[PDB]
């Protein structure tokens, strides 16, 4: 059976020996990358016993840092049906599909990726869904797609860069609202491989903080990842 | 060029090729691009070196993809001949992969070696 | 506990196949056309041929 | 790329301890059909290596 989660648009599917975090399928009948999903119809159709409309793609904390944060116990995710999310580092559009399933038909996901091949799979998924825009550009050059992105509510950041706080810094200084959401996945082995990960996490938080964000909470993703942090902060307020 | 994890000739290349030779003496060594590819796709691989002296480097550019998928460290040394007699083959080995077991000092040397490769990437 | 014990048993199966494939690769060294290094003899000594494959 | 197309005989042989197939789709190229005998499996190997390259 499926009950809602504490967040807006996130669902949790409780079964007999397990539970499965899941979103609502925006384009029904189609799995993106080959994942398990759930079909159910509205009631009054017990005589019918055929699932047609309602559909719920099962969301994997091993293939998604944001599902690793929601199962990691995050306070807010800043994204709701109706939001505008600027996704950074969008390889193949998988977690972009789950974010697009959260913000739904009236929302808008602004997917940015550097690579052309994940660009192509992103154009496949983003041709199937009509709330996600495909942007294949460098995230270190936001003035390339300044004609493409308006002021968004949330920025999600998953790039494996050493200058991650600078990239998200200038992207928020062009595209993120007054008092904006920011949700960064951090890999301590990717920023500084010879330093301890708590010190790398605290130093990246300090670089956001002198980059004039405001850190609300930090959690480490560690039944599902190693040396990964998820920092939830808010721009200028 | 496409060799962005380029190993430096000041003795990191030398420690790479020396650990190649010691793994060759412990039989932990899959030699050549195809057998390297089999070890990475099967996930046995603990570390993988390539050679940037490849005359078309496209024929070894395919394994950094699956090494990024399997999350194993790869690094390029600038001579397939030095890698070839580092293995002990009498031909030019273009890309080598070296696995590990449960308990060996070789596995310790792999651990410290991909610690240095992680200092590169 | 049930998926815990299935994790334990599946890891024991995979380590059994890993040690078995390692034993067969060592016997490819010990049963080779020319003297290669690798493997232990029954004395306890290990076979280290310091040659090259010409 | 040598054994593309012959996976039923191949995993039959590998799970049953028997002779693996020498070639797959490759056999209807212009070269391993040109050879005959042991040259068939031999040029199947080296054509498959050069064709991965």
């Amino acid at each position: 059976i499926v009950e809602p989660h504490r967040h807006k648009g996130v669902f949790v599917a409780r079964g007999g020996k397990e539970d499965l975090l899941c979103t609502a399928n925006l384009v029904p009948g189609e799995s993106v990358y080959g994942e398990k999903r759930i079909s159910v119809e509205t009631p009054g159709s017990g005589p019918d016993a055929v699932a047609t409309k309602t559909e719920y793609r099962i969301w994997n904390p091993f293939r998604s840092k944001l599902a690793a944060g929601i199962l990691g116990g995050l306070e807010t995710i800043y994204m709701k049906p109706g939001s505008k999310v600027l996704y950074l580092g969008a390889a193949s559009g998988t977690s972009v599909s789950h974010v697009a399933d959260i913000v739904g038909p009236t929302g808008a996901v602004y997917a940015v990726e550097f690579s052309h091949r994940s660009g192509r799979d992103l154009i496949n998924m983003a041709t199937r869904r009509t709330n996600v825009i495909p942007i294949v550009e460098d995230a270190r050059k936001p003035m390339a797609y300044r004609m493409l992105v308006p002021m968004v509510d949330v920025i999600f950041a998953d790039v494996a860069q050493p200058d991650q706080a600078r990239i998200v810094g200038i992207n928020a200084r062009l595209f993120l609202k007054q008092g904006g959401g920011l949700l960064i996945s951090i890999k301590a082995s990717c920023i500084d491989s010879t330093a301890p990960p708590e010190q790398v996490f605290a130093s990246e938080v300090q670089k956001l903080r002198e980059d004039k964000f405001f850190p609300k909470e930090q959690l480490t993703l560690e039944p599902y990842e190693r040396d990964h942090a998820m920092v939830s902060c808010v721009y200028l307020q | 060029s496409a060799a962005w994890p380029k190993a430096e000739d000041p003795a990191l290349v030398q420690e790479l090729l020396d650990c190649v030779q010691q793994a060759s003496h412990y039989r932990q060594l899959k030699k050549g691009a195809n057998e390297t590819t089999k070890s990475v796709n099967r996930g046995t691989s603990e570390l993988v070196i390539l050679a940037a002296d490849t005359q078309p480097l496209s024929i070894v550019l395919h394994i950094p993809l699956i090494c990024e998928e399997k999350n194993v460290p790869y690094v390029y040394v600038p001579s397939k001949v030095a890698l070839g007699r580092a293995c002990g083959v009498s031909r030019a080995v273009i890309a080598v992969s070296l696995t590990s077991n449960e308990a060996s000092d070789l596995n310790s040397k792999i651990r410290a070696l991909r610690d240095k490769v992680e200092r590169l990437a | 506990e049930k998926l815990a014990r299935k994790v334990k048993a599946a890891r024991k199966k995979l380590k059994a196949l890993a040690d078995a494939e390692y034993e067969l690769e060592l016997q490819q060294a010990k049963m080779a056309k020319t003297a290669t290094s690798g493997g232990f003899t029954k004395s306890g000594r290990r076979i280290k041929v310091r040659e090259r494959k010409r | 790329i040598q054994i593309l197309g012959a996976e039923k005989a191949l995993f039959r042989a590998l799970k049953t301890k028997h002779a693996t197939p020498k070639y797959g789709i490759i056999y209807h190229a212009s070269l391993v059909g040109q050879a005959s005998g042991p040259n068939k499996g031999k040029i199947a190997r080296q054509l498959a290596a050069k064709i991965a390259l």
Binding site: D19, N60, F62 | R42 | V7, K13 | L14
Partner: peptide, 26 residues
């Protein structure tokens, strides 16, 4: 060795999937 390699391939896939479901249960 061909048989042991194929059985290790199948068992490695089973351990990846079953460990993923295990950490999904806890």
């Amino acid at each position: 060795l061909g048989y042991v390699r194929t059985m290790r391939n199948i068992a490695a896939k089973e351990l990846k999937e079953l460990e993923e479901r295990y950490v999904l249960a806890g």
